[PDB]
Design a protein around this ligand. Structure first.
Ligand code: B12
Ligand code: B12
Ligand code: B12
Ligand code: B12
Ligand code: 5AD
Ligand code: 5AD
Ligand code: 5AD
Ligand code: 5AD
Ligand code: BR
Ligand code: BR
Ligand code: BR
Lengths: 197, 194, 194, 198
């Protein structure tokens, strides 16, 4: 399989329920593109296409679920293989009501690859609870991934302002004006996140 | 006590310590054993501690997310046998997924190709995937009762030739109403296939 | 294959030239023991046994080569998957004359897993040329044989970088003292010491 | 010119930058292309720069170790097919291993189960392993000439049913003396093996 066909190959393996084949195709991508590269060039395009195919009525919700669950497992595997250094953690989650978690996982992964102790909480964390954990662990930052815009629109002005000494917001659902309204620093690029600390 | 030590390591954000304690459990008890003796008691205690106001939601999230990662690793270690799959998920509105993962694990350990979908699958979509994969069975984990109560009579009937329902949120009467076979314990689930 | 049989399984796979089987068994070990664990419980015992079988005349050099080369590849894979943080590097190598490199790779791996920017140079680096300017906060050396250390004059390791660590089967506290390095018994204690 | 950028990143100890430049090369040139356009020219230049005293041994080590790791990844990506293996190594006393790895890589790309042993294998031990595994061939990379000169006439002839020799340290006359089939080009290796000796 040529690299430019890995995405279709992987989606086709998943849609036939061939998890073993899908795992082999993902590892090929990992070896060809490298860790960050396989996420950019294989995991993300496949998930985007799964969303588009669902939207057009070509696949159902259970096919997306199968694929997303598989790809989340592949990223979790990579995350655990990255280093987890000592020192004040960075808490990584999604806003209340945001159930798309893979962006947050990606952010945690990019941070850990640069030696940052990113604690991935899972998605959908109430802000008082997030603030309390950050305070208790002496967390240097909180990072939020917003895939949809609506969970941010549901938050009052300044809702993110005091969660931790630094609060970063990114993802397709976020922009600079909404970050400003909510009292977070907007970050477009996962690359720029490690630098900013 | 490994369970208390694991929860304490998680609550300090000591992922390295937590992973070391989990691996000790795994080496001592083995795969099935670590679930029964460590993973499940910790999750139960996390729930109880949250309910009593002793821990917050972010602490439960960290612990649950960690343990889900460990169980996913055990799912991959059990392997995914060949042949017509058994689809495993949770009812629409059920966001507790670890029960479903557990069921998939126990089935895989008995050589059954349990394909874990993730949680919260609309029934028409689940039916369609079962049909497209020629799935011999569907298995649902219900942790809460409310998602089952929201479903129409007979809604689980014929998702596949065999449809199994278990978890704390399920009981025999609700399974009957919904057209599923009720399974009390994971032990009975593997048997009901083999 | 059960965890207790992974070591003999892996060695058997390697000795029959079954690299695909060997890779699968190594990954099983990785998933069961975790990254540091698979190195301690699978890579190291297999390599020890390879050495013992060679020394007793039971296997030839080509068989050891095959196994060592494979296991070095597996560790390099894990090393590249670990984070490589910014900041002043720690250079990792072996003394002049020391061609056993896997200990050094292990040291670099343990450091990277704790967020230390361990630059693995490969083995067998002339003490002068190791004067790599890059602002290295430390140098770490793995000694497998004792003879390459014995060949060095007193204090030969003293000022390679602000801190100089020495460990491995070929090193002890007295030899580290004579050469002017800090002795480290455990890979675990290496990251802490920084 | 990716080559100069890669070498400069490595000499700064910027592993992340070096890996990013290597991956760009992979995406532009593909697997065989990145070897020809990036890995090989960089190693050659590292050798020349050391020989002239421009870089030290630690710098060469850093670069060689990095590129060996990248090639090992490509070996695994090419896959290891089933069937009688081809053993790939270097002569006794030859510690340069990357040529052997290249040969294994080109064989695997053509579906040949090239089992890379690592470098520096005693001949009787190599012969014994080839015989025990029913290997169809042995392939040797000679970077230096001196390890070949040390060998007696015909030393390579019966290591396996077919024995191939190449690398900068080998030439046709030395291959003839040693009883190996000489190969210049890595691309021609799978072809040569698939056809009879003659
Ligand atoms: C899988 C998935 C789901 C799964 C998620 C499973 C899980 N995570 O456990 C589930 C089933 C939960 C789901 C639910 C729904 N989803 Co959905 N789904 C997706 C899908 C297919 C992939 C999601 C994914 O992981 N993408 C990868 C994402 C993270 O990458 P990315 O967004 O391109 O982000 C890049 C950058 O943003 C950056 N980044 C991300 N986070 C951060 C953070 C920081 C700090 C930084 C610096 C950078 C950064 O990283 C990426 C690298 O380029 C997408 C398709 C898509 N185009 O995204 C939809 C999609 C997001 N979903 C969509 C919809 C409509 C829904 C539902 C409303 C459907 C419904 N009716 O129930 C619900 C909403 C639930 C909720 N409240 O959140 C729409 C949203 C469209 C919109 N915004 O209007 C999409 C786009 C599909 C579509 N084409 O219509 N979904
Ligand atoms: C982790 C967790 C969450 C996480 C789950 C994350 C995830 N991705 O899975 C999140 C944050 C999403 C969550 C959300 C909520 N949850 Co919650 N949470 C839990 C917790 C702590 C663990 C869940 C778990 O994994 N259990 C798996 C194991 C531990 O459950 P078990 O009882 O041992 O299951 C056994 C059997 O049922 C069997 N089994 C399970 N499934 C199946 C299937 C078959 C076929 C068979 C044969 C057997 C079988 O296997 C197990 C061992 O035998 C529990 C505590 C608990 N006691 O379960 C609550 C708990 C289930 N949650 C609870 C509540 C109230 C909530 C929320 C309403 C909170 C809120 N206000 O938002 C929401 C509802 C979300 C939803 N719509 O589903 C309550 C429910 C009480 C009730 N029924 O009224 C609990 C019990 C906590 C408590 N003590 O109060 N939760
Ligand atoms: C593979 C191997 C080789 C390979 C190495 C390939 C490569 N690395 O590129 C090659 C073929 C080159 C080789 C050559 C030789 N080797 Co050799 N070989 C081995 C073997 C089988 C495995 C080595 C290995 O990688 N071990 C795995 C590592 C991870 O284990 P460890 O190194 O015990 O490390 C542990 C600790 O020391 C610690 N650690 C290691 N480094 C550091 C550093 C720090 C800072 C810290 C804190 C901890 C630490 O971490 C590890 C986890 O516990 C061993 C057998 C054995 N018992 O070690 C011999 C062995 C070491 N070799 C041996 C010999 C004799 C030779 C040769 C002399 C043989 C020859 N005549 O050619 C040469 C010498 C070459 C030279 N160095 O000059 C003997 C040495 C006996 C002795 N005590 O004197 C051994 C023990 C075999 C035996 N006889 O049983 N060898
Ligand atoms: C890195 C390196 C080392 C490393 C090896 C690391 C490892 N592999 O584990 C180490 C540190 C061991 C090393 C040490 C030494 N080496 Co050195 N180094 C190199 C270097 C830069 C790369 C070697 C390499 O990877 N070659 C692969 C590629 C780059 O070579 P190539 O010419 O493109 O090869 C092509 C063909 O030959 C073909 N090919 C190769 N094998 C085969 C096999 C078959 C069957 C086929 C068909 C084709 C084929 O494929 C390639 C592309 O087409 C070369 C420089 C060079 N080769 O130009 C030297 C070089 C070979 N080393 C040299 C020297 C001087 C030494 C030392 C003697 C230094 C010393 N005093 O210690 C030692 C000797 C070690 C030994 N006993 O072998 C000199 C050799 C001079 C000479 N006498 O001929 C070189 C040429 C450097 C130089 N320019 O001065 N070296
Ligand atoms: C964005 C993703 O959300 C999933 N999706 C759409 N509707 C639902 C629902 N009711 N329940 C669960 N998941 C849903 C689809 O599979 C889509 O691809
Ligand atoms: C059952 C689990 O649900 C979690 N939980 C309770 N309330 C919420 C909420 N609003 N958002 C997310 N998770 C919540 C708690 O952590 C509890 O432990
Ligand atoms: C410690 C390891 O060194 C290897 N070893 C022993 N003698 C040689 C030699 N002449 N050439 C290469 N490797 C050798 C053996 O395979 C042993 O296992
Ligand atoms: C061919 C390569 O061999 C390396 N080289 C030269 N001398 C030594 C030595 N004493 N020890 C290790 N490597 C050495 C140089 O770095 C050169 O680039
Ligand atoms: Br996961
Ligand atoms: Br390697
Ligand atoms: Br390839």
């Amino acid at each position: 399989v040529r690299p430019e066909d890995l995405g279709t190959g992987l989606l086709e393996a998943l849609l036939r329920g061939d998890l073993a084949g899908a795992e082999a195709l993902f590892r090929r991508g990992l070896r060809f593109w490298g860790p960050e590269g396989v996420l950019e060039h294989l995991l993300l395009p496949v998930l985007r296409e799964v969303g588009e195919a669902w939207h057009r009525g070509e696949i159902g919700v259970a096919e997306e679920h199968l694929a997303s669950t598989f790809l989340r497992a592949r990223l979790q595997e990579l995350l655990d293989l990255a280093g987890f250094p000592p020192g004040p953690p960075v808490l990584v989650t999604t806003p209340p009501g945001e159930r798309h978690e893979i962006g947050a996982m990606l952010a945690a992964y990019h941070l850990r690859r640069k030696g940052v102790p990113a604690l991935y909480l899972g998605p959908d964390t109430p802000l008082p609870d997030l603030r309390a954990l950050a305070r208790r662990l002496g967390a240097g930052a909180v990072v939020l991934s917003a895939v949809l815009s609506e969970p941010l629109r549901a938050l009052p002005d300044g809702a993110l302002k005091d969660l931790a000494p630094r609060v970063f917001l990114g993802g397709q659902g976020a922009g600079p004006e909404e970050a400003r309204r909510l009292g977070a620093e907007y970050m477009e690029d996962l690359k720029g996140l490690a630098e900013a600390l």
